[PDB]
């Protein structure tokens, strides 16, 4: 069907990735398991040596609705571990890629990477630090997690070395170890790790993923480890619409990471938006992003709610408390009015599917999803059709405006209170400058 004559632009992509992961490292640079010991013994990050954990990156960026997921669909001629940054993203790619062909249950990066329960409740960044790829600052940052993960991994092998020894009697049986054992993590089977929507991750989490991948590959002596094979993270995401510092931003901005990764030769940009169908909205969104100058002409189209009276089935995007106030008053007045009234929200549930009750309300328990009022920050990733924005001035940033106005297919369903392009608004043009220079690079690949 005609909408997929950008698939031809996806093949060069795969070539690079196939080129990028076939590359073997030299033996003196491959990390050795002894490194991951005495990390388990070191009490405070102060004793970490300068050691370069290798990796490669092939980055994917573009607005939502650009078709950035079509690349992840096409990466099923390559052996890969597709993973997501949020459970929502993981399920979204499960549905997206399991609708096209076979697909193993896609987990978040935290199910890979070993992240577990006793890791959310961990304060981070307490240890200080004062460039070279020689990563240490990231592990110092994210050290409670890294330390606990390494201690757990060492505390609990020979699943792979045994087959290697048996073949040393007579490298094949090593590859069949995943088929035989049902617990070995997915980092053990491939070096291509695709991360959907990488902007929802911390800039330290790149180094942590590279670290734990090498750690599992060493603690298990998996064949790719024996092949001097290096991690290849394919970070698909939206830099401008997603937000510390982003992994995608970390890669696009940091000059030593931008030159070790050699991005200009290893980056694809998705320029299209199959979602929006109206021209002026498209031009506005094209400006918001790409950081073009704001004109009175781009005004006069943005020219073209707190009361719950009249916009039923419209989501009011507010910062954190205003949502609570709105929903509270919603429930409070619907008492005197289809619906009725009975922790991420404020208390008391509306019957709009959330209509039936007993207490498996419709489901095991009663933490639920409303999709009625939900903040701008949480609005990211979730694509809607029933938007109505409530910007507050004095802390207005065009990142927030560009997000909030881009959750919906058509501007016919767009409402808000103020003009974010008219009031005082903070310009964060550094990402836009980088992306726009990137487009202007002959080695970068661009897909319409």
């Amino acid at each position: 069907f005609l909408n997929f004559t950008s698939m031809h632009g996806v093949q060069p992509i795969l070539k690079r990735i196939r080129e990028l992961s076939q590359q073997q490292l030299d033996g003196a640079q491959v990390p050795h398991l002894q490194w991951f010991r005495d990390v388990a013994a070191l009490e405070s990050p102060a004793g970490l040596p300068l050691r370069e954990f290798p990796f490669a990156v092939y980055l994917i960026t573009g607005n939502a609705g650009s078709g950035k997921s079509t690349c992840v669909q096409t990466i099923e001629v390559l052996d890969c571990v597709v993973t997501g940054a949020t459970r929502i993203a993981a399920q979204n790619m499960y549905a997206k890629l399991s609708g096209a062909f076979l697909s193993r249950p896609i987990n978040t990066i935290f199910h890979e990477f070993g992240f577990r329960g006793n890791h959310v409740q961990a304060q981070l960044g307490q240890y200080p630090y004062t460039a070279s790829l020689e990563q240490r600052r990231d592990l110092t940052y994210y050290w409670e997690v890294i330390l606990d993960l390494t201690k757990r991994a060492l505390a609990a092998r020979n699943e792979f070395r045994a087959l290697a020894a048996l073949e040393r009697t007579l490298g094949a049986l090593t590859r069949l170890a995943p088929a035989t054992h049902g617990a070995l993590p997915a980092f053990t089977r491939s070096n291509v790790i695709v991360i959907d929507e990488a902007g929802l991750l911390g800039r330290h989490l790149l180094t942590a993923v590279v670290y734990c991948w090498w750690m599992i590959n060493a603690l298990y002596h998996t064949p790719q480890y024996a092949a001097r094979l290096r991690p290849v993270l394919v970070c698909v995401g939206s830099p401008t619409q997603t937000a510390s510092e982003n992994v995608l931003t970390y890669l696009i901005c940091n000059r030593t990471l931008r030159e070790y990764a050699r991005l200009s030769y290893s980056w694809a940009i998705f320029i299209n938006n199959k979602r929006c169908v109206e021209h002026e909205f498209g031009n506005l969104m094209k400006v918001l992003e790409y950081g073009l100058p704001i004109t009175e002409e781009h005004m006069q189209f943005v020219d073209r709610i707190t009361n719950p009276a009249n916009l039923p089935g419209w989501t009011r995007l507010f910062s954190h408390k205003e949502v609570s106030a709105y929903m509270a008053k919603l429930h409070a007045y619907l008492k005197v009015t289809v619906v009725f009234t009975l922790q991420d929200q404020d208390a008391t549930y509306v019957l709009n599917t959330l209509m039936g009750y007993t207490p498996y309300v419709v489901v095991v328990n009663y933490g639920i999803s409303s999709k009625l009022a939900m903040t701008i920050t949480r609005s990211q990733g979730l694509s809607l059709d029933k938007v109505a924005i409530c910007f507050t001035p004095g802390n207005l940033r065009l990142n927030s405006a560009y997000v909030a106005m881009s959750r919906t297919t058509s501007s016919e369903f767009l409402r808000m209170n103020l003009n974010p392009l008219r009031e005082r608004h903070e310009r964060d043009d550094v990402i836009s400058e980088h992306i726009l220079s990137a487009l202007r690079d002959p080695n970068v690949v661009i897909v319409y």
Binding site: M7, A179, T180, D303, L436, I446
Partner: protein, 384 residues
């Protein structure tokens, strides 16, 4: 000797396959099947592929080597049978009329050396795990079953899966399934499934009404729904892979030729940022518009499978650089964008057009809504 790759199925298939190797089993269905002779001009390639199939004969060969397989690599063999006897008749029935192959014929044709050659490493692995012929299924059964679940991934699907993923139409099912799962690896075309579906849609060959118009339940009838299809035998089945290559050649020629112009002009236009983004989107529109994509897809469409006919004609996609690539060097990138959006998005009328409709500056409606705050105190500027 006519080699054949058969993607069979069983009403799990892993349990039946292990049992069949074990000589301990259910009838199987050759869903899609390849056919190739070992050891050329595309004319000769089409002729040989055609002559191997036949309108009448299921397969023009006296001796057959059948690798039965299941679902990088998208299919993986399970066991290799041979057919020299008059049991070849059963193979002809299965490949031609879709009749299931009974287990007894399989066992009588199971070439033990080749089948167990490609299993030995897996038995070794199972033993090693247990230590920490194939008949480990008698004791430590569940472990062997689970390991072979993990080994042949997604080889235990539903009929609905093959019917849904691999096409709604007969043509899509037969040809796309066969190509993608078998001939892509055998024969280039490391393309996604949807890509080959789109290429199949362009394979505009003579369709034929079904002698018994049916469609769709479970694993009994999709085999007869495919092996009897006109598309599985003859010029169509013999010319589909060659046309996949030809279509990709034409496309990639056009797309790469236009990427050259875009990429160069993208890295040489010393230009303002506004005009840069205007230019990038204008170039992509002028090259790959829905109208021009439709024109090129028609230009690459074939109507007769034989590459000697080749109803496809040379494409105009790239030669339409004349309209936009005047970049020899109000600016031109804006005015082309205008004379262009006017076409593809519509006429945006004008302000005077509605000022005529109001002939509110004097019409009382200036105080018709602006003076009607209506309790809210367009409106509230300094609400799209």
């Amino acid at each position: 000797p006519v080699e054949v790759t058969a993607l069979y199925a069983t009403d799990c298939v892993i349990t039946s396959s292990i049992a069949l190797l074990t000589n301990s089993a259910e009838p199987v269905y050759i869903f899609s099947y390849d056919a190739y002779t070992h050891t050329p001009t595309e004319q000769d390639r089409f002729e040989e592929s055609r002559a191997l199939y036949q309108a009448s004969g299921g397969l023009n060969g006296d001796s057959f080597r059948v690798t039965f397989c299941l679902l990088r690599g998208r299919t993986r063999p399970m066991f290799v049978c041979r057919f020299e006897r008059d049991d070849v008749a059963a193979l002809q029935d299965a490949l031609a009329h879709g009749t299931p192959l009974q287990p007894d014929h399989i066992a009588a044709t199971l070439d033990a050396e080749a089948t167990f050659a490609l299993h030995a490493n897996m038995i070794l692995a199972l033993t090693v795990a247990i230590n920490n012929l194939t008949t480990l299924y008698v004791h430590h059964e569940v472990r062997v079953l689970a390991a072979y679940r993990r080994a042949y991934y997604g080889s235990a699907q539903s009929p609905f899966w093959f019917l849904s993923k691999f096409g709604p139409d007969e043509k899509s099912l037969v040809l796309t399934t066969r190509y993608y799962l078998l001939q892509a690896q055998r024969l280039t075309a490391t393309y996604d499934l949807q890509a080959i579906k789109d290429i199949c849609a362009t394979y505009a060959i003579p369709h034929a009404p079904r002698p018994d118009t049916v469609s769709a339940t479970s694993f009994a009838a999709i085999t007869r729904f495919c092996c009897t299809s006109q598309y599985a035998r003859g010029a169509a089945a013999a010319g589909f892979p060659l046309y996949v290559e030809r279509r990709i050649a034409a496309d990639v020629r056009e797309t790469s030729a236009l990427e050259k112009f875009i990429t160069h002009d993208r890295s040489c236009l010393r230009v303002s940022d506004r005009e840069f983004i205007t230019y990038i989107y204008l170039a992509h529109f002028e090259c790959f518009s829905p109208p021009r994509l439709a024109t090129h897809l028609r230009a690459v469409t074939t109507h007769d499978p034989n590459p000697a006919a080749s109803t496809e004609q040379p494409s105009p996609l790239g030669r339409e650089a004349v309209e936009q690539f005047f970049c020899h060097v109000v600016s031109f990138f804006e005015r082309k964008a205008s004379r262009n959006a006017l076409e593809h998005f519509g006429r945006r009328e004008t302000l005077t057009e509605v000022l005529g409709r109001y002939n509110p500056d004097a019409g009382g409606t200036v105080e018709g809504f602006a003076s009607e705050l209506l309790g809210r105190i367009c409106v509230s500027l300094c609400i799209d």
